[PDB]
Amino acid sequence: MDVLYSLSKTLKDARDKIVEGTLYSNVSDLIQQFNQMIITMNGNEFQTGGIGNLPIRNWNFDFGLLGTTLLNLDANYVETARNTIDYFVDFVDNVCMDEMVRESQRNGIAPQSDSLRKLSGLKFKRINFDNSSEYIENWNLQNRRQRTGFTFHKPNIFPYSASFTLNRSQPAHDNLMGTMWLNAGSEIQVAGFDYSCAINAPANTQQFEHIVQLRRVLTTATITLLPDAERFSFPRVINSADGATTWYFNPVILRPNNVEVEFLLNGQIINTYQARFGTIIARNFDTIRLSFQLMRPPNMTPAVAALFPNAQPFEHHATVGLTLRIESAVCESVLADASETMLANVTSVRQEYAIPVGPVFPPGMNWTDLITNYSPSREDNLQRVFTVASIRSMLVK
Amino acid sequence: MDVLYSLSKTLKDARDKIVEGTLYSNVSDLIQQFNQMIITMNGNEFQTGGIGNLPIRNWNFDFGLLGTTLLNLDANYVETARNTIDYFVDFVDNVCMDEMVRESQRNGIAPQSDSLRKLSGLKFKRINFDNSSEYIENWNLQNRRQRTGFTFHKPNIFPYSASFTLNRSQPAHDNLMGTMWLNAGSEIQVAGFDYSCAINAPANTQQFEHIVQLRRVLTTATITLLPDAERFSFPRVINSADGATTWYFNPVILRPNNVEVEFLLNGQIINTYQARFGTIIARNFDTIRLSFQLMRPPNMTPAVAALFPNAQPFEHHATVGLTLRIESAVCESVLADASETMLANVTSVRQEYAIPVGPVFPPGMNWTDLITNYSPSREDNLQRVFTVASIRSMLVK
Amino acid sequence: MDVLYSLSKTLKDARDKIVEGTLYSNVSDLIQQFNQMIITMNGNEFQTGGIGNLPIRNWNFDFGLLGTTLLNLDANYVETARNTIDYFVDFVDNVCMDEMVRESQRNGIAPQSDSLRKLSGLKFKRINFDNSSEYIENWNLQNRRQRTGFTFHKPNIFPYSASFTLNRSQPAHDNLMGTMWLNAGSEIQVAGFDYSCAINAPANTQQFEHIVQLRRVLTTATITLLPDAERFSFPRVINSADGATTWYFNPVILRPNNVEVEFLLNGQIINTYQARFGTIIARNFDTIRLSFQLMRPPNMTPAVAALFPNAQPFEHHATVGLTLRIESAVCESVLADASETMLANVTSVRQEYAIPVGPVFPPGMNWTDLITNYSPSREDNLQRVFTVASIRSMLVK
Amino acid sequence: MDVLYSLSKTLKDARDKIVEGTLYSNVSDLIQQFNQMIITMNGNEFQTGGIGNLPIRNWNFDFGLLGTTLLNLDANYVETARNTIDYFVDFVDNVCMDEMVRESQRNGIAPQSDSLRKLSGLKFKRINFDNSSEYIENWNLQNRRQRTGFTFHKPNIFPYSASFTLNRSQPAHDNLMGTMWLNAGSEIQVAGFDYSCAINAPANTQQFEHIVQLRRVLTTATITLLPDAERFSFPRVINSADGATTWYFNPVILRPNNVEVEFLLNGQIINTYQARFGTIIARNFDTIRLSFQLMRPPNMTPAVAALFPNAQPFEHHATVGLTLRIESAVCESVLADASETMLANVTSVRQEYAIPVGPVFPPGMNWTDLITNYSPSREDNLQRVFTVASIRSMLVK
Amino acid sequence: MDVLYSLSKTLKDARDKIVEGTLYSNVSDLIQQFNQMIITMNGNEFQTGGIGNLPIRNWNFDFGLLGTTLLNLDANYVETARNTIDYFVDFVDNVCMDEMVRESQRNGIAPQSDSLRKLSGLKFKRINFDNSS
Amino acid sequence: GMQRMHYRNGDPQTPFQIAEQQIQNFQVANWLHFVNNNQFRQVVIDGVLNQVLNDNIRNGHVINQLMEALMQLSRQQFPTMPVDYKRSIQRGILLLSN
Ligand SMILES: [Zn+2]
Structure with a gap:
């Protein structure tokens, strides 16, 4: 050789x-x-x-x-x-x-x-x-x-992966809560949605989490982390989990609350960043864990208040997201x-x-x-x- | 060194x-x-x-x-x-x-x-x-x-793993269908159970399958494969999947039907054995797949017929199983x-x-x-x- | 060479x-x-x-x-x-x-x-x-x-052998007497069952016997002999000898009585052990003969008496067994x-x-x-x- | 020499x-x-x-x-x-x-x-x-x-030892509590049973314990510990302690609760494992102590509730067990x-x-x-x- | 500083152009440069570390030279060499890292560590080479 | 100590070489290929046409071949026959070395 x-x-x-x-x-x-x-x-x-x-x-x-x-x-x-x-x-x-x-x-x-x-x-x-x-x-x-x-x-x-997980759903798919994502190449985009805008949630906050397990450890990674998942910020008609019907996603975006990114190696946190957007370094990891929350706005102007009623139908779906890209x-x-x-x-x-x-x-x-x-x-x-x-x-x- | x-x-x-x-x-x-x-x-x-x-x-x-x-x-x-x-x-x-x-x-x-x-x-x-x-x-x-x-x-x-998967269940846990197993060391025991004894199943046969992925490839393995899973042949009170309650398992054992063991390597079948119990050789594999069925007995003496009614309550739970041990x-x-x-x-x-x-x-x-x-x-x-x-x-x- | x-x-x-x-x-x-x-x-x-x-x-x-x-x-x-x-x-x-x-x-x-x-x-x-x-x-x-x-x-x-022999049977298979076993590798498990619990048997004792002929003589064997055959201690639905129907086996286990293991060589007893469980030595043999009995309990508490009536139906089937393993x-x-x-x-x-x-x-x-x-x-x-x-x-x- | x-x-x-x-x-x-x-x-x-x-x-x-x-x-x-x-x-x-x-x-x-x-x-x-x-x-x-x-x-x-100890018993042997075991060779199987399913026990928990004293110290032992004692998971008719009569054991198995294995040397704990099943190392010991409990299920589906009434007769006997094998x-x-x-x-x-x-x-x-x-x-x-x-x-x- | 550089292209253009079976011609101009180094070194002792979780490994020098004889490199030649490079490798690492943390405001552009402050010394300058990085 | 079968040549190809395929001591082994080559590298066209077969810059002054010719010699000192032999033989060899 x-x-x-x-x-x-x-x-x-x-x-x-x-x-x-x-x-x-x-x-x-x-x-x-x-x-x-x-x-x-x-x-x-x-x-x-x-x-x-x-x-x-x-x-x-x-x-x-x-x-x-x-x-x-x-x-x-x-x-x-x-x-x-x-x-x-x-x-x-x-x-x-x-x-x-x-x-x-x-x-x-x-x-x-x-x-x-x-x-x-x-x-x-x-x-x-x-x-x-x-x-x-x-x-x-x-x-x-x-x-x-x-x-x-x-x-x-x-590996390419584009899917969702409904943590709360019902046949009509009119009051869902869960996450949807796209993992591909060096990029991850993930959105957490709550049709109810955390109206009945403890502290009016809904927690989300997205975990991605790398097949190989990456070291000395320069990474761009930005709030929002543009890919999941527009209206969609999606197939149900069982493929039997289609649901409607009509997002309205809020800033992700309490963002925490952890780069773990064998279960151990090697790097952790709290709400730090821009360029961050992950020096050795085999797993990325993104945790973020949707917090119902405590104060709302009329136009905002109108999007989030106390009772269904929930027509504007509160969504928070993150985008992470491994540059090198x-x-x-x-x-x-x-x-x-x-x-x-x-x-x-x-x-x-x-x-x-x-x-x-x-x-x-x-x-x-x-x-x-x-x-x-x-x-x-x-x-x-x-x-x-x-x-x-x-x-x- | x-x-x-x-x-x-x-x-x-x-x-x-x-x-x-x-x-x-x-x-x-x-x-x-x-x-x-x-x-x-x-x-x-x-x-x-x-x-x-x-x-x-x-x-x-x-x-x-x-x-x-x-x-x-x-x-x-x-x-x-x-x-x-x-x-x-x-x-x-x-x-x-x-x-x-x-x-x-x-x-x-x-x-x-x-x-x-x-x-x-x-x-x-x-x-x-x-x-x-x-x-x-x-x-x-x-x-x-x-x-x-x-x-x-x-x-x-x-790695030690002892669990179950309910493919059909309901709150009362009075008509379940699924598998339970114990993977530990060099041994695997897996049982497939169907409380209904395949009464409404196509061809009165319920299919089961158990897949185990090795963390390392084993070559030149001498293996003992036997019908029945003694470990899952006795009455048990088990915790529900969500830990909220306990269900009752009252097995009655039937011979596993259409047993097929496949030793795969990277998704490819390297060795396959159809209903062969005793000593078998698996020459190179990273995965074991055990498929077996429960077939409702087409002919039953009164004592047997009495265990399997056309309608609930299902009190005797039809169970089929396999035991596999890697000797060397x-x-x-x-x-x-x-x-x-x-x-x-x-x-x-x-x-x-x-x-x-x-x-x-x-x-x-x-x-x-x-x-x-x-x-x-x-x-x-x-x-x-x-x-x-x-x-x-x-x-x- | x-x-x-x-x-x-x-x-x-x-x-x-x-x-x-x-x-x-x-x-x-x-x-x-x-x-x-x-x-x-x-x-x-x-x-x-x-x-x-x-x-x-x-x-x-x-x-x-x-x-x-x-x-x-x-x-x-x-x-x-x-x-x-x-x-x-x-x-x-x-x-x-x-x-x-x-x-x-x-x-x-x-x-x-x-x-x-x-x-x-x-x-x-x-x-x-x-x-x-x-x-x-x-x-x-x-x-x-x-x-x-x-x-x-x-x-x-x-050689793998898993079968049974009904010494007393009838179409309904509601009052059987016989043995079932599994010979495989270095192990033998055999159970003797009598649905009637020796109610009409001389001395209320039913004799059983299991003979295994080795294809080659083994010398200097260290053997574990234990009472009970766990493999045949649970409820089973079994195919009839002619394959035309299925019978029900619902065992209840009693200690094997008058256990005698003989290791013979060319018809001659080389080693014999009477009711000795644990580790025994068989120094030269081509045949193993296990003899054991089911003796109806002469004294029974109510709960026990209830399992063994004087007349059919016999719903709890008295079973005695042995397990023998050749370690080396x-x-x-x-x-x-x-x-x-x-x-x-x-x-x-x-x-x-x-x-x-x-x-x-x-x-x-x-x-x-x-x-x-x-x-x-x-x-x-x-x-x-x-x-x-x-x-x-x-x-x- | x-x-x-x-x-x-x-x-x-x-x-x-x-x-x-x-x-x-x-x-x-x-x-x-x-x-x-x-x-x-x-x-x-x-x-x-x-x-x-x-x-x-x-x-x-x-x-x-x-x-x-x-x-x-x-x-x-x-x-x-x-x-x-x-x-x-x-x-x-x-x-x-x-x-x-x-x-x-x-x-x-x-x-x-x-x-x-x-x-x-x-x-x-x-x-x-x-x-x-x-x-x-x-x-x-x-x-x-x-x-x-x-x-x-x-x-x-x-040394071969197969016996039981009734901690609570009465002439009819219809509401027993105790343990039964088999110590032989390199293996121990022990079951704790409570006919009452801890109905009147403090915290609805019955404690069990099995101690085995080795005649020689073993060092560098690789041991397999598994929940359940298959040997004591089936119906049995057993002789009473005084040999005067026979009792009925009709087990139903629950997971052993608060399992603790201690490998002691001269009264000192050298190794201790809490509920760890699979492969464990005991580096130097002359005694093994297995402690485990039966905890009455706090939540029971109807089928389970039916096995454990508030009053006798107790027909299904709650049993928890452990199996320990010294591989080397x-x-x-x-x-x-x-x-x-x-x-x-x-x-x-x-x-x-x-x-x-x-x-x-x-x-x-x-x-x-x-x-x-x-x-x-x-x-x-x-x-x-x-x-x-x-x-x-x-x-x- | 420039010193430091050489120490590397030295090893790379080394651990690379020295393989189990090649010609001297590929390295005559190379071997030389190498040795020159060894000399300047041997006799001087070094210290690195002393901070956070950074070990303090100490180093001495006293290594032979290089068979300037052969035409084709016999395996035996390599191994007796790789063993001498692996001390410089595991060294430099501990060297870079040491001056890759100490910050300085005033004269920040310059050297800091007790390891490097000694490298900028004059008796060492005798080493610079191929600066195309 | 190698082929104590001294050798047997009828007339194959390059009787001097062939030894390379069957000699275990690299030093020895390079000599063979180099000597069985250096074909007087017959390829020269200088200062306006001049077929003047040249030869290795190697040989030239890079000399080493010499250094290698020696190093290969520096490890030939062993048994087989009477003593008045290795003694006399290697002693001579050294005079080349120094
Ligand atoms: Zn073994």
Whole structure:
């Protein structure tokens, strides 16, 4: 594996640092590394593909080496080189792709393809170098074992979930109390509604709560917390819990009272914020708990008083809400986020080559399904597959 | 760490192979190894303890070597040796115990004590030897990343759970239908009851189902499956779901109909057994699903007919059940089982020395709590701590 | 075969004693043995597979020895070794598995695969060593023709059997007398019932008896015998012997009277226990006979008298029972038990690779079917197959 | 004593490491040790047996040595060896058995036979070696004086005891209150019953308690504690305390209230658990105290209310219970358990040879009788006898 | 301060370009830089912590140099190196954290800790390198 | 101590190499591939056409090959035959080292 990596930074730091004119010296340490490779190769043969609409190409080697004591590289030098690189390019592509679809369960964390199973071989280790590509940097540390980790923008930790829970309801659905929410990606919006505007509630206050359990711990999270859930601030006709009928939601929004956000880790409060809107830091957590209340306004102008009668029908439904967005965070496990193309690369290669559904990943590499049941096997396969996608993107985008 | 191991098989294969009599030759390869140690040690100082009711003792090293000189060990040789071992014994104990209490989230896996952090040092590695102790054998393979593996008997995979689910109920609780169960350790007992004896059910058959999700995959499991749940075959007065009242359960047992056990892995059926009681093999699974039915007897003698009227009151409650026990299995993660003393050793040392609750383990090393939320951190700490307990038991039981 | 064994303790006592540190002198007697192997191998071609889902991988050899003689093992020494072991590991696996699926009636207690048939060859015999693995220890002693022997906790000697025998019955099934039982694994539960409570029986005593014939003799058995059969102490609706209707069993339990357990060998009483509950020893037997009686209580309080009228209907059914569990025992033939993973290993490898049903073993290696008709051929094949599973578990779990 | 040991690991590590093939350098350190023995022997005459139906055979020696030349072991080498081992095998058997019968009283912890009294001799001590057999490891540490220890699965600490105690009773036995239990092996089941369902009890709660005093302290015990005593959950007709009549028990089960388990050591609470079911650790105790209550349900549905009237007759008897099982534990004294064959071996050899009852052990080595009056003499004799059984099982099973 | 920086790109461009099987050429210009450091260090003792829940781990120095010999890095070379880096890692952490809390109003832009105030020292400046972060 | 079967060459390919696939001591092992290569890297077109087969900058002054040629030698000091052998042999080797 680590093998694979090199094969690339080799070419990039190559197809990049080797141009018409450059003084020699800044490549001496480079040329060398390069050649070393060629040697190890030439002689051994390779097999690529064999599944679905995946071509089956064969490969051989025997390419001259490279000059040493020159000075300034003449055009002629380049072309006689680019022609030798373009075989490795078109190669690696066919290599990544081949091991970017195979999956195993017992040991689906390691190499699979007849291409790679031969790379982990010992006579090959003669290449590994310059491991500064964020992903490999993390692959290794995981191998030896330790505080791994990655960087994500608007991470994708919440499987899509859009639903409601009626804590008080009746057939006519004319006096409900409960919550409705949308958990998706890095965002949570939750609203608590009470058709009665806490008219008969103790202290004229109705308590609400929304708990979200992450499938993986997030550390060093920068989070935006804002009052109100715009998504649940408009009139809706919704299906009943049993699907037998539809109810009407006609919200009027009040400020959430006694807002308390807790970021817990294994049941323990790690961070807690009381009514603090704006930017907050949650340093280590696997659960978010949002508690907020609807408090019936003790003083109301006529226009307001008119919305909240002492008796039904309740036509304006008091609603309070919160919006929470994880802008950035670190996770010890790979995840999809709003900036990295890994998930899209893996999903795209599989779709383009009509790769059959396997035993590990959900059909279509569906993110919601994947994160909902993020088993150790799916994570090991995902990491292997994401690391390969990142190696590929150094050369082919 | 691996260091630690040796220190023991050193002493055992020592306090065992070294006694008044034996001929040199069976220990030449041994004596050597031994001495090597002494050297590396002498000079260095150690800090053991300093937490709770744990004695803080200092240790200096300045000891002789061995008389390769004699032929057949003379008593005098032993005693002058045992006296030097008894300092290492009383030492290691105080060493294991010290690192068998500390915990940390981020880097929970690695060593923590001022005693061990100094052992992983490089100048010590000159000691390893005979790593055939099942546990170390597995520690290593894990730091390299491979299909590890442990052996158990009546493993402890199910957190204690004893409850019921009423699928049909009413205030009087005089015509219920649902299931009740006990999941604990390596056993599951589940009963499906229908007060009406499927009188108005389609095909006079009531379907039941019980699903249990393991926190870790078990492979190569030998399982006993038997019809009937003896635990739920007797009269009971039970608390209602809301705790407001109590209901009466007066079972009469019928054979479970269309029994189907599925051992699934990531949603896929790996093993399925239809009405097969006795010993069955489940080779790889993270979930068990037991489906069974109550079928109203189509033909009934008077005595039977009398138990099942066409109209309430329903006084004899038709019940069908299953009992499943995992006799043995292999798990890639450490677990408590019915034979190994690891959990008990760790829990006992912590209790004896009044070790304060830490950030990783639940109070009292509670097994149910631990397995219910078996996080990666708890597992890494548990494995470290179990491996140390096993090293200790080679000398001190 | 014996060949095979070595190949492992070779690797274990290898991948275990060979780690960064230890002196050469800790493995001198070991290194040697090792090399010897490599030689014998080098050059000979191999093949494994050709059945169901089992790949056909070829293995070629051409390896050098280990002359690097350095006092202490430098890291560099290990890696250049581990890389050579990981070919033997991934090899042996593919070897065990290949001969762990092929069966033979014309005699299976012998090599079958094109892989092993070549191993029993003479030129390979230059390898055997350290046969302290309980199973090989027994393989040898057998192929030489002599008394064998194994160890089991809760052995699996009783094929599943759950039934009843009505000694007195009538169409209405309102006055039955007979026994019902469950023989499974290492346990027997049997109940004797008499709806009439011996009202018209001589001496007001009804005699019961339960005989269980083992398919193999068990020696040195530690057994728990307890009064009562909890499994048959609750109300049941049971199918009639002819399957035409259902009867009602409403037990009330009395202490079994004149309990006598006999452990017989070839018709001879070897051990006999009269009313002794708790732990008893049965030193050599192929049959267990449990005799017990129901004696109508000569003196009854009103509440008791009310359960047992002089005339029908008999609504409370007098029941007496016994429970017997074989905790441990020795058997000259291999058997499944509650601790060993052999049966599960063999069954699991066959299931994973979709191995077709063969001529010797019942479909799915079903234990009940196997032990019910435990022919010499099934036993020889089982022993071969169990011994291989045990060789495999020394390296791969 | 220690002598004896060697004689075996000698043969096992012999009849095992000496097969057609292996190189010499795999046993050089072994061959030697062996010969040494032969010498010391030849010339000394022995005698065994004499008591009961145990033959009396004489033994003489003058056996040749073993070539220390040949590089590879040729078949011919083996056979000329096996023939010499088979005299030691058939010997040792006749040796173990001889000292596995005699018993003393005071100083009955030592050798007895004319065979062994000669072994402890000094001129024979020249044999000891590899003392890694769990039992000898412990014999030594004891001789000197140290903290011994063994590992047991489902140990056998509770002498069989099945009884009841009526705290409130009357001639008709129609309104009883008390407890009934079964203590056996490693398990305890106890039920508390109150026919009146605490109708006139303070706080409508009846307190129960069950105390069990172990004959030996158990340390590092892993225990399963579950609510309910299935064994006492069914209808029974029981003999009265005075044996003059029989009473009726018709239980209905309620959850045990305020469960408290205390593991005490010398009157001090070492571990205490309040209503914790599942797996718990008891680190050091000589007594178990189970306290639990029956609390009359404050709220009852009609069906429940009907079972518990304000006035007699009381026809449904409220019962609460607990089940406790010691899965594993360590004891400083030898004990029988569910896995080791020691007790069975000793008991079996004595039974087979019709050994007369002696002055120390109860007739038939009855476990209940032995553990009930586990005197120092019985323990010393048991340990001697168990250690010999373990030495024998290394060669003969 | 700038000092501090180097200490890292040193390790990263280290724990990264030094793998189980590569060529010296990739690091000749690197190895050198590295050693230079070790020297300047060895002999000087350090202190960190002393506040809230921050442990006070103490550090000494006395580490060997680097095999300037080989062409291809033999595994054995790595391990004898990683073991020396893991002291600098676990070190720097305890260093950053220490000066990542002490605030100062007046001359706030500058160094604070007994750890860093000693780093800005002159005898250390002998280390700066690749400042492209 | 390796292949005490001294060797057996008929005429395969690069009799000097082949040793790499079967030698356990990396130091030793790199020598082999490097020597069995350094094909005089026949590829040069300078200062206006000049096919003047060059060679490793490595060799050039980066020299190390030498340092490695030595380090590999620094761990060849062991048994097999009469003593007048290793003695004489390794002693010579050292004269290369210093
Ligand atoms: Zn068990």
